[PDB]
Amino acid sequence: MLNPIVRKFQYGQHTVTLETGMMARQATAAVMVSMDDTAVFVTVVGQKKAKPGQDFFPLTVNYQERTYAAGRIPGSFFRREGRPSEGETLIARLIDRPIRPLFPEGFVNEVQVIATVVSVNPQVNPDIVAMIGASAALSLSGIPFNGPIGAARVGYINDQYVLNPTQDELKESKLDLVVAGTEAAVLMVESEAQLLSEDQMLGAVVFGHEQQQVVIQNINELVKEAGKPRWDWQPEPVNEALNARVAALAEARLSDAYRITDKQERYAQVDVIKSETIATLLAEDETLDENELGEILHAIEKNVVRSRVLAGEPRIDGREKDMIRGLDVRTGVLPRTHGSALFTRGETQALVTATLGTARDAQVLDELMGERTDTFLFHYNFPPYSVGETGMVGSPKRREIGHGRLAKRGVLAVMPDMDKFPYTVRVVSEITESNGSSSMASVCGASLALMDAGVPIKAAVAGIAMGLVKEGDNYVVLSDILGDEDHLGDMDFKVAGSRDGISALQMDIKIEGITKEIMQVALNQAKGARLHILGVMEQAINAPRGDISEFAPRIHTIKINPDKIKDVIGKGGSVIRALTEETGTTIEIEDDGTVKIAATDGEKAKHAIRRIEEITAEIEVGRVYTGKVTRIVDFGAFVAIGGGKEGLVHISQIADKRVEKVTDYLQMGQEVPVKVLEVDRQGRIRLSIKEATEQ
Amino acid sequence: MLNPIVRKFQYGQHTVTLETGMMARQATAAVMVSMDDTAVFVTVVGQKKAKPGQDFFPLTVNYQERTYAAGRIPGSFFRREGRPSEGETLIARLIDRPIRPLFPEGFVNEVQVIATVVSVNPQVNPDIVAMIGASAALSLSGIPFNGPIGAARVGYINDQYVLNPTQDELKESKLDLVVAGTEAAVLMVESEAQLLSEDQMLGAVVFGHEQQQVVIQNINELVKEAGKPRWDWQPEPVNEALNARVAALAEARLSDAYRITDKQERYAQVDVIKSETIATLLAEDETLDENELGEILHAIEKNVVRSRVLAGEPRIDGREKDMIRGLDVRTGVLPRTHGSALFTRGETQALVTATLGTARDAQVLDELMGERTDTFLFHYNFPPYSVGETGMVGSPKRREIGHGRLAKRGVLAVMPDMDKFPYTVRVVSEITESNGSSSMASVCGASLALMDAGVPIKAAVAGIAMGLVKEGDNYVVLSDILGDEDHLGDMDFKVAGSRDGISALQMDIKIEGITKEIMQVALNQAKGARLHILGVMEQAINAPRGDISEFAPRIHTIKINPDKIKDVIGKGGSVIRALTEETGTTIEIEDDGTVKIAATDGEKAKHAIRRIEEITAEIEVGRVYTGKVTRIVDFGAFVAIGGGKEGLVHISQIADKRVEKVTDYLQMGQEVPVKVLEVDRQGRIRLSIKEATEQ
Amino acid sequence: MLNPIVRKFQYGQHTVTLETGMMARQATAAVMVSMDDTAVFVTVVGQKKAKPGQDFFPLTVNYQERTYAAGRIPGSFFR
Amino acid sequence: RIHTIKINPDKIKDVIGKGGSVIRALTEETGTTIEIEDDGTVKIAATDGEKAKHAIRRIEEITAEIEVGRVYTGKVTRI
RNA sequence: AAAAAAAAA
Ligand SMILES: [Mg+2]
Ligand SMILES: [Mg+2]
């Protein structure tokens, strides 16, 4: 017999029902969380034996949208769900980023959270359900875990926040925000707004957290009822003796080494002191593990840089907390792309390039909620020659598929509606050099490229990453944190928006609790920095160009009869294939008879127009048709005319005189007008050169 | 001028042509076996130096179907043969399962059998040829190999067995089973039957074996003719000292431990026993091998459990040999799938979900034998959390593509005929906890889900996994064998049928010398257990539900006049594209007048069939024919009622005098009755107002 | 701020333009060679310290053609 | 391969039939694709020589021009 | 012989 421990409550409008104990009894824990007929079956399994000699914590969060949830057989050729799509990877990262800071420091047991989507209802997004389920499952399992973390989605409709809006409500909403936080403080935010002020975004965050408190309480109650006993896991007791021994020699020397302005001399000096210290540590006692010394050195460097930045001393870069690194904006750097730009900020650089295409190129996304065509593709490539180290290129890693979406949220607020711009822009952004805040450099470069290719975006956008170092009640916000500073910064949040409002927000706070006031001050400083960046960017190019680049495919429209569109289709599309091959353009066909002629140069456009038009023009009374006899036989020559319908001039209908040889009557290359009296349907169209040959 | 060695023999109606020595000389041995114009080129490469510290036999059998065998450029976009398809993986496992238990114990040199298919007669299936080829290659190579293994594929026609049938015959057979065994015993059987009785299945097995004795003899002849010298390979001699100091010190305590009925006490006891023995044995000598110590301990405990079950003591589970584990059955456990079930037996369970799709979703796979469209998809998912360990979710492994086909073979016997139920059932089963016999739990759950979703299967169908243990003349047969017991069992079966008959008989013996009476007794016990499981399942769901789920797309089939299809549809498919784009349904047509209407909503299909009946409206006597004339001309009254139905109203039938304005006597939009007098060949239709106003 | 070093010459018929120093400063070297409106951006990254106990030279050359070069969104179903 | 045969152009409509039922039935019977032009040239495309032979024979039975000495199978259906 | 335009681219 099976004893399913079910616990259901009320969340917003829907009724979440947590249900454990019945399935996957062999995994460490598994809950089937269902909200309003959308059910996600999350399950956690964490090994007990620490892998001997581990340095990083290996948490993986697979998320699978099984397409039998909506109730459809998959569309792939193998008829089976395969590699996870970009959406599923995005939601996996969205589940991953809240929980990882909650596992206590010094935990290195492999833990894997496989949240599959068994059933979906089109109004309720499964992702929030999966997040709630992941938190509930982790809390039930007894793996060392500090929060039972809720998830909430808030939307802005009629200036009033709505919790967990349905997709139809979401279409009206200005802002879509996901806030996942512990009982104590927010723990992550991943937004996409529509140029809202900072106060509105902050209110949304605080509202979502204050409301998801309920899910948190109820998961705690379930854990208390039917959870497993907590693991007997103790962090490695801090070897204060060795730490103090290394510190007594290293503290002042590394403080002064970091105190000097030049970066590379400090690099070399601290590396040689590191070599000296590890040499002494090994020589004095071989048994001491190398990774322990590495951790000690990491602690020393982190501590010294944090103590420095807290006291107000200039950062490792040498800038004040406000100062943004110098920028250099370049546009049209690529000769033949539809539009390109190169946004270098400090050491972070991005070569962004926007390319227009016709509606046939829009990605057709087949996801659980519904089929959806995308007419704005943003891809973000992070090649390994950026950081400075070799590495195998390949399919995009999760972080690239996450930052692609982040930059796309950054730019989506200002893209034009399809009726105003009937193209499908695709923006790529290769990161030639990275030193921190790469995705926001990509947002700036994408705004630049779009403004250059000729897209009529509303206003340029720019993104500035930020940081925050807090100890006790003393906190200093950091602007444009470097890659090195990112380790030090407690909270990393990225703000990207036009001058008016915030297009996208992506907080990722990690330590203790940050008061609303802290977030407000940080957001205001980010607004200032973003205004400065936008000014500098406006100095280079202030308004999108007049028209698209000459290479860009222009749009030409022609109207044709509905049967004629079938005629131009032909057998499986042979006529259209031949037409595009001979003219070199791209033609789109609709059932209502509109024709979309898309070609770069107007000459190819008019070539397509004339070539198609000859077939489009119906045979009309009085007007002669141009026909060339392709084959001559002794018993008659038929003048092939085209259009699927050929009229034959039988040997008995040419003249009453005995036609002896067609060669002496019709010569190779005889372009003569043919008198067509009518168009018959029986397939024997009457052609007559006799009336045209009398004169 | 190298010279091949060819030996050809009759094997049924087809003739087989083994041939070696000509190609692939550098491989350890290669054999081109061709049966009746179907040729499979099999080659085997066996390394000579075992990798240091190898513990498991790394034999990997590949199998590639080259699409140039049938004479066809590949369909794939790259026009190149891709990764192994499902059929190729299945046939690879087919080749693999017989030849693995045949290599002697302790052999660990890598071996690779690559079987390519270079020419395929669309009648004789290649898999049997490839099995004969792998057998001949391995037995020719001189790699230590017990006996050459022959393959057969018995069919069942007119209650008379038939050897190795052709697809034309196979379309009429009830059963096809691939019995492949060496001369001594039947190594493997893989079956699919239309509810055949056990006795018939066993007769088929023994018949196939008695027949492929020929292939055995003739591969033996070819080996004696043109073979290679057997390798000098000797098994590692067992260490009598280690065996003694483990046995006399621990085996009695281990027997007393396995005497304990509870699982956890026994676990703790065996742990303390092995730890104590390892501790004292290292205390005697540290150089003694820990790995070999644990291996010998495992051998001891295996011998203990085997001696326990043979004597007749209760098994590790505590069940008697006949009795099945516990059972629990739920249906409709998911909210929005078309049908679902959660068949949990003991500690092995599966969450199966059947999802009906329209006839456009059927998988169309291109095989060498010929392009075949598959309208029943079974998919088997074995995620890592099921067995209780973390892992790498990804593409399905070979086990998953083997058990998918096994379960699909088990259910295919009872699924309905396409005339009685036009859909495309796809069944997905996710194992959420597996402890042996997972695929048979999947079969039970699939029958359950099918009966839930509403498909009218002919009868419930369930599967059980038997196990056989034999020593000398004493043999005991187990039921619902666990995963741990699998090491102990020698012969594994997987009988899976309805109460009337068997549907799948996959089996894989290892020991040599099982009389067919043993198999008869085991099959009888399996019939008993399967009747029990079906009795339990009978409580949850009695018969398939009358109506499919409301979410299901609903297919309605109507019959229409085959001649009027060109009158109502017309050329180019204009109106059919119009209806499919206005109603959003999929409509296809046959030459006889059969048309299916597929739409995910009832009312939408009602609208579609309304449109079809209006456009195909006959000349019903007494029904009003409403025509809307908005503008009147001199030549007639143009009224649009669709279907190309236009009539010329003559001026001589309006009034006797010449009309100066038609609007004085004929009203705009007024309803005119139109009686069709006759339907001519040219499509001429006339309108009759005078005779239709009064009648 | 940053300034590139460019040197362009006549090569047969077209005019090649070698340009370095502007982009990809963090790689070991990187030059964007273009030959009459056809640019190719090559970057070399060599490790400073050899792998301990290495026997074969691990040169790996990758050449990727971004479809946006021609001016077309790619054709692959994932675009 | 492609098999080409020339039959009288006027006698096509006898074998094509109303709405092309005869030709489509014959094609699904022989598994090939027959092509006919207004001048009566019969173009048979086939994926095999045997299917080509089957289609060509079925064409000779009915589609061929009426030949003297060719025997017609006449069966009464009702007395 | 009824019908845009390719995970297986
Ligand atoms: Mg950062
Ligand atoms: Mg088993």
Side-chain angles (χ1 to χ4, degrees), chain B residues 451-472:
Chain B
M451 262 188 283
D452 187 352
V455 303
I457 50 184
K458 313 174 161 152
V461 46
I464 189 56
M466 315 313 297
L468 194 271
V469 172
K470 176 202 192 72
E471 201 88 340

Side-chain angles (χ1 to χ4, degrees), chain A residues 64 66 74 76 79-85 88, chain B residues 393-396:
Chain A
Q64 315 161 139
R66 296 216 179 303
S76 161
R79 249 62 172 192
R80 183 147 179 208
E81 316 95 21
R83 287 261 161 280
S85 45
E88 310 159 20
Chain B
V393 151
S395 55

Side-chain angles (χ1 to χ4, degrees), chain B residues 436-438 465-466 481-483 485-486 492-494:
Chain B
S437 86
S438 185
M466 315 313 297
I481 188 173
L482 319 171
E485 274 174 312
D486 205 339
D492 309 359
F493 334 56
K494 283 193 200 342

Side-chain angles (χ1 to χ4, degrees), chain A residues 24-26 32 37 45 47 64 66 68 71 73-74 77-81 110 112 119-120 565-566 591, chain B residues 334 336-338 346 353 360-361 363-364 379-381 386 388 390-391 393 424 426 430 432-433 572 577:
Chain A
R25 267 170 313 170
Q26 211 125 332
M32 182 178 223
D37 291 9
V45 41
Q47 281 166 358
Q64 315 161 139
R66 296 216 179 303
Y68 69 78
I73 310 194
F77 170 71
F78 284 129
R79 249 62 172 192
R80 183 147 179 208
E81 316 95 21
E110 177 144 12
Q112 187 200 30
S119 158
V120 125
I565 120 250
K566 173 54 212 92
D591 300 277
Chain B
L334 305 193
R336 205 148 287 250
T337 7
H338 295 73
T353 90
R360 176 181 82 267
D361 286 309
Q363 180 174 29
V364 44
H379 291 153
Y380 175 92
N381 286 337
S386 80
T390 161
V393 151
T424 303
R426 153 176 193 240
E430 303 135 11
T432 57
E433 48 163 310
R577 304 154 53 150

Side-chain angles (χ1 to χ4, degrees), chain A residues 21-87:
Chain A
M22 195 181 42
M23 303 205 217
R25 267 170 313 170
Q26 211 125 332
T28 306
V31 295
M32 182 178 223
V33 46
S34 89
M35 149 171 4
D36 220 304
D37 291 9
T38 278
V40 169
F41 174 57
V42 197
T43 166
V44 183
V45 41
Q47 281 166 358
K48 315 210 70 153
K49 284 313 302 303
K51 282 294 315 303
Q54 270 266 20
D55 52 8
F56 78 129
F57 168 52
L59 165 89
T60 90
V61 183
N62 284 107
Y63 168 98
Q64 315 161 139
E65 270 175 8
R66 296 216 179 303
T67 175
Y68 69 78
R72 302 180 322 253
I73 310 194
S76 161
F77 170 71
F78 284 129
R79 249 62 172 192
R80 183 147 179 208
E81 316 95 21
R83 287 261 161 280
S85 45
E86 152 196 79

Side-chain angles (χ1 to χ4, degrees), chain A residues 193-216:
Chain A
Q194 269 219 20
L195 313 190
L196 325 170
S197 87
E198 304 91 1
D199 305 69
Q200 315 183 251
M201 287 296 258
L202 215 64
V205 157
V206 78
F207 169 88
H209 167 239
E210 183 154 349
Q211 281 256 9
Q212 78 165 10
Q213 280 320 127
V214 161
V215 163
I216 284 180

Side-chain angles (χ1 to χ4, degrees), chain B residues 94-165:
Chain B
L94 232 307
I95 299 192
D96 187 338
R97 300 223 311 286
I99 62 163
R100 192 172 290 241
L102 263 176
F103 289 106
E105 64 285 349
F107 195 68
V108 285
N109 314 339
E110 182 155 359
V111 177
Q112 205 206 20
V113 188
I114 292 181
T116 313
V117 169
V118 294
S119 147
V120 44
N121 177 353
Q123 292 304 353
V124 290
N125 188 310
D127 56 46
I128 285 319
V129 188
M131 216 164 314
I132 310 185
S135 146
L138 287 171
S139 80
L140 263 174
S141 100
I143 286 164
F145 208 40
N146 301 348
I149 45 113
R153 192 218 286 289
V154 193
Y156 201 71
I157 305 282
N158 315 337
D159 315 328
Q160 264 301 346
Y161 297 121
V162 57
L163 208 171
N164 227 144

